[PDB]
Design a protein around this ligand. Structure first.
Ligand SMILES: Nc1ncnc2c1ncn2[C@@H]1O[C@H](C[C@@H](N)CC[C@H](N)C(=O)O)[C@@H](O)[C@H]1O
Length: 262
């Protein structure tokens, strides 16, 4: 259909099992989680290992200044807690509150003791779509249930964005919101309006797998929404037609350290 994003989606759903798994990691940056996995088994809760691949993703963003976490942090759809625990290590942050659905099929928050864990409070069993908004200085959201249907994803992304705006009008100046399907017309229009009222821009995280078109709307980014999205659709589409396959590119999963913060 229209938009490069839609052709990408069509081509993805047409791949065989083996090519789909090969393609999703091609040329993306991927942190090694071996040590984190063995620490979980041995119960090593103070080794400083992140609880998921999510922290390395948020680190990429914060390290490039796409946002500057500060004050009270609320993390919607915290899952295991990768973003909460990473935010707990930032000096400007003083409180981290995470909410996640939990329950069968969903990740439960993992309680570990990486640096600043005492400032973190995660509550499971909370479907954020029904929870009235709360005040915060930094708002984070990483919700986006994928679907083979681009229309389903468009609807789910709009739902997220309308939910997120309820927390934004409260005052959070700093934010990072995952936009599951940014290429569909309704999300493009919704984002253009959201960008007018709250600034920021769409950024493609190189740690994301090629099997998802997800991009992050962060407060300290800018630029045309259509341009940014199409640019990403092109990179994703180009990775399907390579003749030389190099697989995922290694990067160390940085240690969060341990201890508590005053
Ligand atoms: N309606 C919802 N309300 C609250 N949480 C949700 C909802 N839908 C999905 N989720 C959670 O959102 C999470 C998405 C994850 N990718 C978050 C990972 C997290 N950012 C990390 O770094 O570890 C999942 O754990 C889902 O269970």
């Amino acid at each position: 259909g229209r938009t490069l994003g839609e052709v990408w989606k069509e081509r993805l759903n047409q791949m065989t099992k083996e090519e789909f798994t090969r393609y999703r990691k091609e040329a993306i940056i991927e942190v090694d989680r071996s040590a984190a996995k063995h620490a979980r088994k041995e119960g090593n809760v103070t080794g400083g290992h992140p609880v998921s691949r999510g922290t390395a993703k948020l680190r990429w963003l914060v390290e490039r200044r796409f946002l500057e976490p500060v004050g009270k942090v609320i993390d919607l759809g915290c899952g295991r807690g990768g973003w909460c625990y990473y935010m707990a290590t930032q000096k400007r942050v003083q409180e981290v509150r995470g909410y996640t659905k939990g329950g069968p099929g969903h990740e439960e928050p993992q309680l570990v003791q990486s640096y600043g864990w005492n400032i973190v409070t995660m509550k499971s069993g909370v479907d954020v779509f029904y929870r009235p908004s709360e005040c915060c200085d930094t708002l984070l959201c990483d919700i986006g249930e994928s679907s083979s249907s681009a229309e389903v994803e468009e609807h789910r992304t709009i739902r997220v964005l309308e939910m997120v705006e309820d927390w934004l009008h409260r005052g959070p100046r700093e934010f990072c919101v995952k936009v599951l399907c940014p290429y569909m017309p309704k999300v493009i229009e919704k984002m253009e309006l959201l960008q007018r009222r709250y600034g920021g821009g769409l950024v493609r995280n190189p740690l994301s797998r090629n099997s998802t078109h997800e991009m992050y709307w962060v407060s300290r980014a800018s630029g045309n929404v259509v341009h940014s999205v199409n640019m990403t659709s092109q990179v994703l589409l180009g990775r399907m037609e390579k003749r030389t396959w190099k697989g995922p590119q290694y990067e160390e999963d940085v240690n969060l350290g341990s201890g508590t913060r005053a």
